[PDB]
Design an enzyme around this catalytic site. Structure first.
Site, PDB file in Angstrom:
ATOM      1  N   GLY A  29       0.814  -1.202   0.000  1.00  0.00           N
ATOM      2  CA  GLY A  29       0.000   0.000   0.000  1.00  0.00           C
ATOM      3  C   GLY A  29       0.860   1.271   0.000  1.00  0.00           C
ATOM      4  N   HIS A  47       8.689  -6.173  -3.548  1.00  0.00           N
ATOM      5  CA  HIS A  47       8.155  -5.379  -4.713  1.00  0.00           C
ATOM      6  C   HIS A  47       8.635  -3.936  -4.656  1.00  0.00           C
ATOM      7  CE1 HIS A  47       4.420  -3.293  -6.620  1.00  0.00           C
ATOM      8  NE2 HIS A  47       4.928  -4.052  -7.603  1.00  0.00           N
ATOM      9  N   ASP A  89       5.843  -6.126 -11.016  1.00  0.00           N
ATOM     10  CA  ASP A  89       4.424  -6.297 -10.665  1.00  0.00           C
ATOM     11  C   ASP A  89       3.993  -7.766 -10.806  1.00  0.00           C
ATOM     12  OD1 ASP A  89       4.281  -3.579 -10.230  1.00  0.00           O
ATOM     13  OD2 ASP A  89       3.197  -3.091 -12.087  1.00  0.00           O
TER      14      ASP A  89
END
Length: 121
Positions: A29, A47, A89
């Site tokens: 987030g 990531h 991703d």
């Protein structure tokens, strides 16, 4: 961009990305990393470290091409930065699906203010 990333997480995990991962643990987030709370959170930690290699493209806004073939995410050629962005991703979507077995709703809106500062990538 967040659109491709959100779509990949939904294709791999079957979960609504924003509800499940828009604010999970210390790394899934809004921006920054923190010490991970569990395996799902560590997918997001990895990531965000992966995004550090990108030069010339913006991971939130820039669109890129990919397709779903034999239930696999396949990044298209794009350009060098967009291809690295697409592979960062794709890897987090796969990792979130691999760790769904320990996903814990109690970390969903975890209090980021309390996360331990992240070590360097």
């Amino acid at each position: 961009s967040l659109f491709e990333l959100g779509k990949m997480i939904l294709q791999e995990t079957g979960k609504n990305p924003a509800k499940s991962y828009g604010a999970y643990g210390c790394n899934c987030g809004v921006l920054g990393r923190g010490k991970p709370k569990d395996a799902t959170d560590r997918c997001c930690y990895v990531h965000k470290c992966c995004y550090k290699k990108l030069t010339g493209c913006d991971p939130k806004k820039d669109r890129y091409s990919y397709s779903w073939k034999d239930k696999t995410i396949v990044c298209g050629e794009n350009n060098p930065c967009l291809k690295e962005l697409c592979e960062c991703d794709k890897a987090v979507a796969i990792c979130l699906r691999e760790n769904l077995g320990t996903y814990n709703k109690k970390y969903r809106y975890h209090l980021k203010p309390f996360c331990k500062k992240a070590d360097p990538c």
